[PDB]
Amino acid sequence: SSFESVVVIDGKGHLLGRLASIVAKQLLSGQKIVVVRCEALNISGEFFRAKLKYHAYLRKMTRYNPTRGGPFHFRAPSRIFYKAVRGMIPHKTARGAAALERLKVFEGVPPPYDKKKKMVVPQALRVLRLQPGRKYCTVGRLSHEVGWKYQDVVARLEERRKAKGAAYYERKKLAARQLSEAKKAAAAKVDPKVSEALAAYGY
Amino acid sequence: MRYIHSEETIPVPENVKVSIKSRLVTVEGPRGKLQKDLSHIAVNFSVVKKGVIGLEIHHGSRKDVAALRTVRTIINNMIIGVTKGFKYKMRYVYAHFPINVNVEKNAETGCYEVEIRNFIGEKIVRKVVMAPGVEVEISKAQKDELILSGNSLEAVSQSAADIQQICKVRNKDIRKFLDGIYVSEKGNIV
Amino acid sequence: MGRLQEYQVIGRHLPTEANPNPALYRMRIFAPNEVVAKSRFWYFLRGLKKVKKATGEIVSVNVISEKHPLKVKNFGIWLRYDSRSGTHNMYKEYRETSRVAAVEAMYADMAARHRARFRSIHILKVVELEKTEDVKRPYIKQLVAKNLSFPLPHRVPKISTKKIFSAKRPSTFS
Amino acid sequence: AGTINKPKKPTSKRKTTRLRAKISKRAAEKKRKERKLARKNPEWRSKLKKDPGIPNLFPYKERLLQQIEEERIRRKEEL
Amino acid sequence: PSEAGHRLYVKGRHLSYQRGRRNTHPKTSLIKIEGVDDTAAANFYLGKRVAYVYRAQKEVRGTKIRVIWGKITRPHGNSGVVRAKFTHPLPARSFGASVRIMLYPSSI
Amino acid sequence: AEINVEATSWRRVEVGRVLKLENGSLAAIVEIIDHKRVLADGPSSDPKLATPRGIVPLSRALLTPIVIPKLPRGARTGAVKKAWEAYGVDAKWKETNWAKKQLQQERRQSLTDFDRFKVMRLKKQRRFEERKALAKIKAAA
Amino acid sequence: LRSLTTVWAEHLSDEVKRRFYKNWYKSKKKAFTKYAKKYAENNGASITRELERIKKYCTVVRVLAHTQIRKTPLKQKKAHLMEIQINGGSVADKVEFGRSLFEKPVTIDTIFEKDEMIDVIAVTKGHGFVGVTARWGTKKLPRKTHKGLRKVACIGAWHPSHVQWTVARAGQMGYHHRTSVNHKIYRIGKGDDEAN
Amino acid sequence: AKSARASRIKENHQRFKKNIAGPVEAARLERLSAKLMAIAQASGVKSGKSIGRKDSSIVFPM
Amino acid sequence: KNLGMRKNGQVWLPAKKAFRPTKGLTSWELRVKKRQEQAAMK
RNA sequence: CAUCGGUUCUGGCGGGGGGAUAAAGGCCCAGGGAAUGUGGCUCCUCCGGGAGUGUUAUAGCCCUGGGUGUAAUACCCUCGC
RNA sequence: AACGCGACGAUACUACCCGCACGUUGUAGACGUAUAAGAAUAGGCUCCGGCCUCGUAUCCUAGCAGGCGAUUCCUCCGCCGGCCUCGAAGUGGCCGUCGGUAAUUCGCGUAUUGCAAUUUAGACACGCGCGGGAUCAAAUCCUUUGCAGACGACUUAGAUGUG
């Protein structure tokens, strides 16, 4: 348990409903949540079950006027996760609306969240939850086959971001090597009594 | 019932190289090199003996134990493909209109292309593109025969199936109209 | 069905002028406590010897403890259970360190695999298999195999449920 | 069928109070009718049910049969 | 100069009133203390004085900042949430707002 | 016919394998009951590492890299203790990295306010030395 | 798609500056006067920087083009301005092509050619408020029908208790945006040709 | 009748586009682009070669 | 080389063994002894 | 804030009793036995290990009786701080 | 989308920008509100030696809410300027100047807020003030138009002209 300014969550490898429940509880408790890479979220079960559920969703519309009052079918993966979250919050109240304003959802990782720490939720992670052999699908693939138009643009932007992250990781590895060398070199120059005092304290 | 341990063994010939990493099996031989991603199947690969690959499943059900036989046969087919190869001989027969088969190789894509003309007098030109790594030749020993050879059994058999299915007779009695291209022989190149 | 114990329950019919020394009857009852043990004992005597509770008495109730609870043993359980088709025999095998543990595992197993409750199951015999060759079921024959040793693939690590967020993705290799 | 691409009208699993009450009343009427038919039933029933016996895969069925022989012999000797 | 902090309290969040599914009771509030995740951890903070600090529009007696005072009474649930009783019930708008749990009265 | 295979090499539940329980104690596996429970015994002279003989669920334990060689199946506490002392399980466990992490955790948990203040001051002095070394290294290349 | 930058030419005509005004006769006509100075400030450094930004970051390049409405017999003096996409080539080719095309007249026969089908986009003839008979082509009711006959008899005769959006209603007819396709060009005639 | 969305009609149209209309459209495009090309041809910070900064939010205010 | 003919024509298929996941739990002689004991019991 | 009273929630510590005077278990004493057979011996090998034989040897286990022992501990009940 | 967004042009004032001067100005709620690999999970990481349950970690963390003067150190931080760089809703890197700075040790000050009472302290936005720098615009009514029109709305024209 910890209180943060905002929690940025990598949405890759997470289950939709469990992540939505945990995020909704955090929002109602008062924690600001940003979720990135919503196109990489996971739904348990085979893909045609999710496709059938979204087509059954697409069936429903206000009969006398589809421009007002009807279920507006948002095809984007971030919007699908937002719908899952909003179904778990009393959104028609002022408190629920205020809890919804504490949430941001995106496809990919737009800046400046690409240079921020992304956390994971182990209670929603698919490798930690699903039984081996059970099938699962991708919310981004579902979105692409129900009409989302920006799978390729997000993929190209993610490749560019990953190349820049690879360069940053090369610099980070160089810095880590230099830090280890610095500690090894300075270990001879620290006062010995300081050294065994810190060692006995556990540092 | 979950079975505590189950295992299978695949022998490897002397001139065959096998490399498995993250369930990506690469098999290289005299005829070439093949790859197959088996990451959708839970299996532990090991080298139980010199020239023998061991496949293990731990605490698996009957379905999971039975999948190892399919994995074994797939890897053995890759080994046979890179050692001896695979060859499908097809025959095209006709009653009145002679079927004209032209085989070319597309330089840009590197794949073979088969054009079929005069199938029961039709004016359309059927075009079927082979999978990469599959070579098609018009046979010289026998009459009206194509030969499809390669290292991938799946690619060779699927190319043969596409050629067989492109020449389908529609809205005619099949007891009377016997025209078409059929797989006449399956075997190894060597 | 619960933290069971084995009770030796001995009872009899009340002495009369015609029968001054009635016979004693002993059963082994797997029950959560002594009240349930005596109730099951009187139910079984009503089913078998037509001796009612009002015309009988309990002579003794004792607890039978396992002789070697630190020894791994194989148990064969012969039981009869009731479904809507009727009563059916069943022989099953359980690998435990005590008869009471074998009986609770049997109750959970019948509940899971045949939806049988406590009232519909009659425990007819619980025996400890003296030799390895007495083991019949393959799911115990694989466990009594020679030099048994297995790995544990795909172990989900224990993470506290109060720790919502983690900075690193976990691993399933230990 | 084209169920995935074009699903039909869903079948509701949400109950109605009227149907729940009607089903409960019909279940009570059916159990009372079964009690009446079992009372009026002329089908023959045995006094003693056919016991299934000892299972063959029980490893000590032979020793159980030995015990049954010994007990019957002892009872015949006592009587 | 110094560059450390000055915090001598523990952070908490005002979750809700004591409630059933439908009925709520503002006389008791639920507080989530930071780092407190079980009943044995929550037993340390029993009897501690908790302050809800908020702002107002008009300056009264030299300040615009008002405080509602209360105390932690008993643990709630199994996950370290505590029950708190204040002098006046906390505002219903402050569901999700922060509160300060003090280290006094101290028994250390 | 050369084969290159890269897969997972798990530690195995077997007789002689030492388990670390959630309370930090150790227990050698004497008999395997099933795939979820074993019979285990920790006959250690150190009370922190000792475990009474009994059933251990595998979900509550972790596999240490220590295996007592030639430990018989079903061996009682005296034989398990003799094998334990002959193999020197306590010393190898102390040399493992899990016990070092546990010792560091205990040392950090046992600190007081004055201890933490001294930790901060001595770490600042060592950090000054390390910062000089890092500046010298970065100025070199 | 998101517009990143626009680069304008140094000199804009009065008929295209009229597009940015509602009361051009009253205005000081100050539009683009400060923009025209940045061609001379720092040798057009800002112009070159924006052109390089389009070259390096963008994927779609469109020129801005306006009509010479003064050569028409129309009384309108304010010209029409639109984005015309450059297709073909690379992004640098498109940017250099547009920059070379700055302040230049483009004739119709260099964009289109005789014997080509094109698409025509326009707003249709306005008709005002029109009843259902001419707006939707409904059948007329019989003669002397009560409460009118140029109408639809039943608009909501079944459930729901609403008028549905698919039912013909009286309203605005014409003045609609339309995109008609596959129109063949029969002749591209030149203005200076006295026998076109 | 085969519809406008039929697979065989789409394949026939694709073959027509590739084999017949394509060269004609390419030649017309070459002529038109040649004519319009004929008309069209008829410090990094201080120079603008280095792209500097020009002269609702995605993040929470902090 | 293989001398027999395969029915479906996939001559590359290996000589498969029977699918017996419980193979090796009990020996043959113990099963013979159990056969004799079960026959006497019956 | 301290010292109290009433009601109540919760944590820890010192004792007593019961049962097969818990059952186990450790260490000794006296018997008996077997394999998922230790050591040894024999035969095969891919030299890694298999197969057979037989009762503790260069590991151990199981069953019975006895001693320490009114042992400890679990569980239940109970007197207090 | 009339309570989604972008680019661009011209912007008169009490309008715009810069420096500081504070708010009986406001905000679902600051108090260290610190921390970027990617990827797999029947496999990974690496400095290539080895390492991996574990963020129970790392950084930061002392001084009147943090002074003054030394001793001593060349470590860390901040603002500007130059060169590069960053377009997914655009911002970081290097160098240079200047200012500050216990890694060691010491002296002088702290009291009286009286035994606790938010520790009034942060960020963003808004407003009133000065002292400077920069700029002199449009829209509507009205007349007209008929590519339009129930009325509004819409396409036009009205400043010297191809009116």
Task: Give CA–CA dist C120/F31, Å, rounded.
Answer: 35
Question: In terms of C-beta density within 10 A (0-12 exposed, 13-18 middle, 19 or more buried), how is residue C81 classed?
Answer: middle
Query: How many contacts (CB atoms, under 8 Å) link A and E?
Result: 26
Task: Give CA–CA dist A136/H19, Å, rounded.
Answer: 44
Per-window interface: B 80-109 vs F, CB < 8 A: none
Task: Tell me the two tokens of residue F34.
Answer: 């099933």
CB F66 within 8 A of CB F118: no
Task: Give CA–CA dist B176/B120, Å, rounded.
Answer: 13
Cβ separation of F122 and A198 shorter than 8 Å? Answer: yes
In what side-by-side order are the strands of the sheet with B100-105? B100-105, B112-117, B126-129
Task: Tell me the two tokens of residue B144.
Answer: 């009206």
Q: Do chains G and E touch (3 or more CB pairs under 8 A)?
A: no
Element (H, E) at A202: none
Task: Give CA–CA dist G53/G5, Å, rounded.
Answer: 8
In the complex, which nucleotide's C1' lies nearest to the CA atom of residue F77?
J26
Per-window interface: H 19-58 vs A, CB < 8 A: 58
Angle between helices A77-86 and A16-29 (to 10 degrees): 60
Check CB contact of A152 with chain G, cutoff 8 Å: no
Cβ separation of E15 and A29 shorter than 8 Å? Answer: yes
Task: Give CA–CA dist G52/G95, Å, rounded.
Answer: 9
Task: Give CA–CA dist H31/H38, Å, rounded.
Answer: 11
Question: In terms of C-beta density within 10 A (0-12 exposed, 13-18 middle, 19 or more buried), how is residue G1 classed?
Answer: exposed
Task: Give CA–CA dist F121/F135, Å, rounded.
Answer: 21
Task: Give CA–CA dist G164/G155, Å, rounded.
Answer: 8
The C1' atom of K36 and the CA atom of E40 lie apart, in whole Å, by 37
The answer to whether some atom of strand J lies closer than 7 Å to the beta carbon of E74 is yes
The answer to whether some atom of strand K lies closer than 7 Å to the beta carbon of E61 is no
Question: In terms of C-beta density within 10 A (0-12 exposed, 13-18 middle, 19 or more buried), how is residue D28 classed?
Answer: exposed
Half-sphere exposure (Cβ direction) of C87: Cα atoms closer than 13 Å: 14
Amino acid at G29: K
Task: Give CA–CA dist G54/G61, Å, rounded.
Answer: 8
Q: Is the peptide bond before G160 cis (omega within 30 degrees of 0)?
A: yes
Task: Give CA–CA dist B83/B33, Å, rounded.
Answer: 10
Task: Give CA–CA dist F51/F28, Å, rounded.
Answer: 9
Task: Give CA–CA dist B128/B159, Å, rounded.
Answer: 8
Distance from CA of F41 to the nearest CA of B (A): 24
Long-range contacts of B161-168 (CB under 8 A, 24+ apart): B162/B128, B163/B90, B163/B114, B163/B116, B163/B128, B164/B90, B166/B116, B166/B126, B166/B128, B167/B92, B167/B99, B167/B116, B167/B119, B167/B126
Cβ separation of D62 and I37 shorter than 8 Å? Answer: yes
Amino acid at G184: K
Per-window interface: A 5-24 vs H, CB < 8 A: 5-6
Task: Give CA–CA dist A181/F130, Å, rounded.
Answer: 10
Closest CA relative to residue B9, chosen from I2, F12, I16, I25: I16
Cβ separation of C150 and B1 shorter than 8 Å? Answer: no
DSSP H20: I
CB F132 within 8 A of CB F57: no
Task: Give CA–CA dist G111/G131, Å, rounded.
Answer: 42
Check CB contact of A48 with chain D, cutoff 8 Å: yes
From residue F83, give the alpha-carbon distance in Å to each of C154, E29, F45, F95.
Answer: 31, 59, 13, 19
Query: How many contacts (CB atoms, under 8 Å) link D and I?
Result: 8
Check CB contact of H59 with chain A, cutoff 8 Å: yes
With b for 16 or more beta-carbon neighbours within 10 A and e for fewer, the A133-157 pattern comes to eeebbbbbbbbbebebebeeebeeb
Mutate to test the interface with A, among F122, F128, F136 (most CBs of A within 10 A): F122
Per the structure, the residue whose CA is closest to nucleotide K124 at C1' is H61
Task: Tell me the two tokens of residue G89.
Answer: 């080539």
Check CB contact of B2 with chain F, cutoff 8 Å: yes
**Using what technique was this structure determined?**
cryo-EM
The C1' atom of K139 and the CA atom of G46 lie apart, in whole Å, by 31
The per-type count for chain B, helices as H runs and strands as E runs, is 2, 13
Coarse DSSP helix, strand, coil percentages of chain H, rounded to the nearest 5 percent: 65, 0, 35
Distance from CA of A186 to the nearest CA of F (A): 5
CB B148 within 8 A of CB B129: no
Angle between helices B153-166 and B62-83 (to 10 degrees): 90
- Which residue carries 């006509």 as its tokens? G29
CB A107 within 8 A of CB A37: yes
Per-window interface: A 61-100 vs G, CB < 8 A: 63-67
Sign of the CA dihedral B50, B55, B58, B61? negative
The answer to whether some atom of strand J lies closer than 7 Å to the beta carbon of B9 is no
Question: In terms of C-beta density within 10 A (0-12 exposed, 13-18 middle, 19 or more buried), how is residue B101 classed?
Answer: buried
Task: Tell me the two tokens of residue C18.
Answer: 């015609």
In the complex, which nucleotide's C1' lies nearest to the CA atom of residue C8?
J20
Task: Tell me the two tokens of residue G144.
Answer: 């002397």
Per the structure, the residue whose CA is closest to nucleotide J76 at C1' is C33
Q: Where are the alpha helices (DSSP H) in chain C?
A: 34-48, 99-114, 138-141
Task: Give the SS3 label for residue F80.
Answer: helix
Q: What are phi and psi of E101, to 5 degrees?
A: -95, 125
Check CB contact of G4 with chain H, cutoff 8 Å: no
Q: Do chains E and B touch (3 or more CB pairs under 8 A)?
A: no
Amino acid at B39: S
Task: Give CA–CA dist F43/F54, Å, rounded.
Answer: 12
CB C74 within 8 A of CB C128: yes
The C1' atom of K100 and the CA atom of E1 lie apart, in whole Å, by 10
Closest CA relative to residue G4, chosen from G38, G55, G41, G44: G55
The answer to whether some atom of strand K lies closer than 7 Å to the beta carbon of G22 is yes
Task: Give CA–CA dist B19/B28, Å, rounded.
Answer: 9
Residue of G nearest to A149 (CA): G1
Half-sphere exposure (Cβ direction) of A192: Cα atoms closer than 13 Å: 0
Mutate to test the interface with A, among G165, G166, G169 (most CBs of A within 10 A): G165
Check CB contact of C112 with chain A, cutoff 8 Å: no
Question: In terms of C-beta density within 10 A (0-12 exposed, 13-18 middle, 19 or more buried), how is residue B19 classed?
Answer: middle
C166 CB neighbour count, 10 Å cutoff: 14
Closest CA relative to residue C59, chosen from C29, C22, C18: C22
C31: alpha, beta or left, given left = phi > 0 and alpha = psi -120 to 50? beta
- Furthest C-alpha separation in chain I: 50
Task: Tell me the two tokens of residue D38.
Answer: 């079992």
Task: Give CA–CA dist C158/C83, Å, rounded.
Answer: 40
From residue A154, give the alpha-carbon distance in Å to each of A11, A51, A109, G62, G166.
Answer: 14, 21, 9, 24, 38
* Resolution reading in Å: 2.5
Q: Which residues of E touch A28 (CB under 8 A)?
A: 95-96
The C1' atom of K66 and the CA atom of A139 lie apart, in whole Å, by 54
The CA-to-CA distance between both ends of chain H, in Å, stands at: 65
Closest CA relative to residue A8, chosen from A162, A117, A121, A101: A117
CB A7 within 8 A of CB A31: yes
Amino acid at G88: G
Question: In terms of C-beta density within 10 A (0-12 exposed, 13-18 middle, 19 or more buried), how is residue G44 classed?
Answer: middle
Task: Give CA–CA dist C140/C96, Å, rounded.
Answer: 11
Task: Compute, in degrees rounded to 10, the torsion defined by CA atoms H48, H51, H53, H59.
Answer: 170
Sign of the CA dihedral B39, B43, B44, B46? negative
Check CB contact of F34 with chain B, cutoff 8 Å: no
Task: Give the SS3 label for residue A47.
Answer: helix
Task: Give CA–CA dist B19/B25, Å, rounded.
Answer: 6
CB E15 within 8 A of CB E81: yes
Element (H, E) at B47: strand B44-49
Cβ separation of A5 and H62 shorter than 8 Å? Answer: yes
Task: Give CA–CA dist E73/E86, Å, rounded.
Answer: 10
In the complex, which nucleotide's C1' lies nearest to the CA atom of residue H61?
K124
Task: Tell me the two tokens of residue G117.
Answer: 């089908």
Q: Do chains F and C touch (3 or more CB pairs under 8 A)?
A: yes
CB E79 within 8 A of CB E65: no
Task: Give CA–CA dist A147/A76, Å, rounded.
Answer: 8
- H, E, C per residue of chain D: CCCCCCCCCCCCCCCCHHHHHHHHHHHHHHHHHHHHHHHHCCCCCCCCCCCCCCCCCCCCHHHHHHHHHHHHHHHHHHC
Q: Do chains B and G touch (3 or more CB pairs under 8 A)?
A: no
From residue A181, give the alpha-carbon distance in Å to each of A177, C73, F137, F138, F141.
Answer: 6, 58, 8, 11, 13
The answer to whether some atom of strand J lies closer than 7 Å to the beta carbon of F70 is yes
Closest CA relative to residue A197, chosen from F120, B155, G52, B85: F120
Task: Give CA–CA dist G38/G54, Å, rounded.
Answer: 18
Cβ separation of I11 and B187 shorter than 8 Å? Answer: yes
Task: Give CA–CA dist H52/H49, Å, rounded.
Answer: 9
| Angle B117-B122-B128 from CA coordinates, rounded to 5° | 40
The answer to whether some atom of strand J lies closer than 7 Å to the beta carbon of C65 is yes
Per-window interface: E 23-82 vs C, CB < 8 A: 37-38, 79-80
Cα C168 from chain centroid (whole Å): 45
Task: Compute, in degrees rounded to 10, the torsion defined by CA atoms E96, E97, E98, E104.
Answer: -90
Residue of G nearest to A63 (CA): G164
Positions of chain J reached by protein Cβ under 7 A: 1-2, 9-11, 19-20, 22-27, 35-37, 46-48, 50, 59-64
Residue of H nearest to A110 (CA): H58
DSSP A119: B
